[PDB]
Structures are given as structure tokens and as C-alpha cells.
Design a protein around this nucleic acid. Structure first.
Ligand SMILES: Nc1ncnc2c1ncn2[C@@H]1O[C@H](C[C@@H](N)CC[C@H](N)C(=O)O)[C@@H](O)[C@H]1O
Lengths: 21, 282
RNA sequence: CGCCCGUAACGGUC
């Protein structure tokens, strides 16, 4: 875990990755 | 040192092994250089590295079996190839980054030579996977700061995170040296080369921020843990597991793993020093 | 006067 979630930050990146494409 | 990793695997005749981190093939080409009547399975999620693995398979036909994939998908490819659990005499894990992805600037790992902010070990195999540029161009301050502080062991997280979010709102970050100047700007021109290395060598101030993104975009920690489990199940009783750690997190994970903790199955036989620790599965 | 490294004793939130 190490504190930082990866799936939560992933879709926040995807919601940025597609609003550019 | 390479010749003391094979010293722990103890390869004999007829044994079969797994090099979950093939890379340029240093450890693999050192096992065969000691004894050749073996069967090594070579895994690496880097297409540039696995290219050498199968370039050696056609060279050592009755020995090498190249495989491409991450640690997280090593269980599927091992089963789909005809490998049952409890089969390997030894499993090798050499964590970190191969010299191919750090030196070649087109892959964007080095801040020395300029390439794009890519930082992906998988490279082109998954183009929908976010790059290091996509990370610093999306997440917020409180999220970027925690990635640098934990994954990168950076003390001045909020300072660097605020420097990234401000340079972002002007122009997107898409290169390695472009990002290195942004973080170095959060400090006066003095601090750019103040930090010293283990050999008292001068290092850039972005070297920790780059290491955090290197671990985050490739998910080095979560993929390491699933790789430790997969190595445990495909090792036979009496099989040896050698793991080269290269920072506190990679070392604490394998430490808590071999002891059997999350927050009796292993005979820990070696701990040397860049920290090695080998064990035996029972 | 600012930064970096290391150390040390400080205070309301998980
Ligand atoms: N989580 C991971 N999943 C799959 N492969 C990885 C992972 N982390 C690192 N690697 C690979 O392991 C290699 C690590 C390198 N140090 C290679 C070591 C290799 N023994 C050599 O001779 O250089 C790199 O080529 C990476 O592509």
C-alpha cells in the first residue's frame, strides 16, 4: 500500500488523459 | 557484484532457474558461465531487454526460454507455458533499472541526456499506459507531494510539488531536462548540485523526484510484492531466492515478505551489501 | 541573508 493509492490516482490521470485526446 | 549472486544460487547440473529480471543478461550469462547443463527462464517487462533474452535463446537453444512481461503477469505466462508450481531450483530478482533505459535518452529516464518524459520500463508494449509526463501534468499538489515524499524519500516535497503545479499552469511538462529545471528552480541556484552520493559524488537535486516517478509510473512496489509471491509458489522446497534491493522500500518489502508480515516459510541464509538478501524456500 | 546535509529538543489533525 505505502500510503498512496494507484487505482484512485490512475482514473484521475485517465480523466485527464482523455480530455486531451 | 555479479559473481557473488551466482555464489548464492549454487547452480548445479540439471537444475532449472528463473531470472525474473533479465535486463542485459548479466546474471543469466553468469549462471551459464559457471555451469551450462541448466535451463534458465528469463523474464523482463522491458521489450528492449527481452529482445536480448530471445537473442540468446536462439543462441543457447536447449537452455534459455525467453519471456516478456511484468512481475504481476508472471503467474499467467508461467502457467500458460507449461510450468507447474514448485518447479524452480532458484529464482533471481535484480530490481532497479537496466542501463539500457537509463543511458538511451529516447526512453526518458536520465536527467543527464535529454529525452521525453517517458520513464516507462514497458516502453511501447502498452501505449495507453501513463508516462511520467502524464503524471506531473494531471495530479494535484497534495497527491504529487506524497508520491515524492514516500516513493522518492524527498524531504522538501511541498516545495517541489508547488514548483511543478505552477510551471504546469503555464506550459505542460514533456521532457526530462525541462522537469529537472522546474524542480531545481524551487531552490536557489546553490542547491542544484549540493547533495552527495554514497561515494561522495555530486548529484542533481531532481535525482529524488525522478526516482519517485520512476517507481510510481512503473508501480515498482506493488509489482514487487506480487512477484515475491509468484517466486515463492514456483520455487520448490529447498529452492533459493536471491533479491537485490536498491532503496529502503524495495528492501523493507522483501524483508517483511521473507519474515511473513504485511504491516516460518524461509531460511534466510545471506544478507550482504545496494543490499542483497537470499533465502531458501521450505 | 538564503540553501543543503546531519543532529536535537518542541506544539493542534490519521
Ligand atoms: N516490476 C518489474 N516487473 C518486470 N520487470 C522489471 C520490474 N522492475 C524492473 N524490471 C526489469 O529488471 C531489470 C533490472 C535491471 N537491473 C537488469 C538487471 C540484470 N541482472 C542485468 O544484467 O542488468 C530491468 O531491465 C527492468 O526492465
Amino acid at each position: 500500500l505505502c500510503g498512496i493509492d494507484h487505482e484512485a490516482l490512475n482514473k484521475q490521470i485517465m480523466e485527464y488523459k482523455r480530455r486531451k485526446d | 557484484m555479479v559473481d557473488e549472486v551466482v555464489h548464492c544460487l549454487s547452480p548445479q547440473k540439471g537444475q532449472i532457474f528463473l531470472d525474473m529480471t533479465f535486463g542485459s543478461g548479466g546474471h543469466t550469462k553468469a549462471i551459464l558461465q559457471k555451469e551450462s547443463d541448466i535451463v534458465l527462464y528469463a523474464l523482463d517487462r522491458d521489450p528492449t531487454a527481452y529482445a536480448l533474452a530471445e537473442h540468446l535463446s536462439e543462441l543457447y537453444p536447449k537452455q534459455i526460454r525467453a519471456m516478456l512481461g511484468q512481475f504481476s503477469q508472471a503467474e499467467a505466462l508461467l502457467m500458460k507455458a507449461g510450468v507447474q508450481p514448485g518447479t524452480f531450483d532458484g529464482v533471481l530478482m535484480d530490481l532497479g533499472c537496466s542501463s539500457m533505459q537509463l543511458d538511451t535518452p529516447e526512453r526518458g529516464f536520465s536527467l543527464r541526456k535529454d529525452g521525453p518524459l517517458d520513464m516507462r520500463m514497458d516502453g511501447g508494449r502498452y501505449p495507453d499506459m501513463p508516462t511520467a509526463a502524464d503524471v506531473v501534468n494531471a495530479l494535484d499538489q497534495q497527491a504529487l507531494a506524497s508520491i515524492l515524499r514516500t516513493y522518492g524519500e524527498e524531504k522538501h516535497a511541498k516545495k517541489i510539488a508547488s514548483a511543478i503545479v505552477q510551471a504546469r499552469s503555464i506550459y505542460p511538462i514533456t521532457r526530462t531536462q525541462q522537469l529537472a529545471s522546474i524542480v531545481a528552480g524551487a531552490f536557489p541556484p546553490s542547491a542544484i548540485y549540493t547533495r552527495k552520493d554514497l561515494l561522495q559524488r555530486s548529484t542533481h537535486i531532481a535525482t529524488k523526484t525522478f526516482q519517485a516517478l520512476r517507481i510510481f509510473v512503473n508501480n515498482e512496489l506493488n509489482e514487487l510484492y506480487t512477484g515475491l509471491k509468484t517466486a515463492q509458489k514456483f520455487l520448490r522446497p529447498g529452492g533459493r531466492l536471491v533479491a537485490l534491493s536498491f532503496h529502503s522500500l524495495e528492501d523493507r518489502i522483501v524483508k517483511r515478505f521473507l519474515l511473513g508480515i504485511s504491516m516460518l516459510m524461509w531460511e534466510l541464509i545471506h544478507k550482504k551489501v545496494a543490499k542483497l538478501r537470499a533465502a531458501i524456500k521450505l
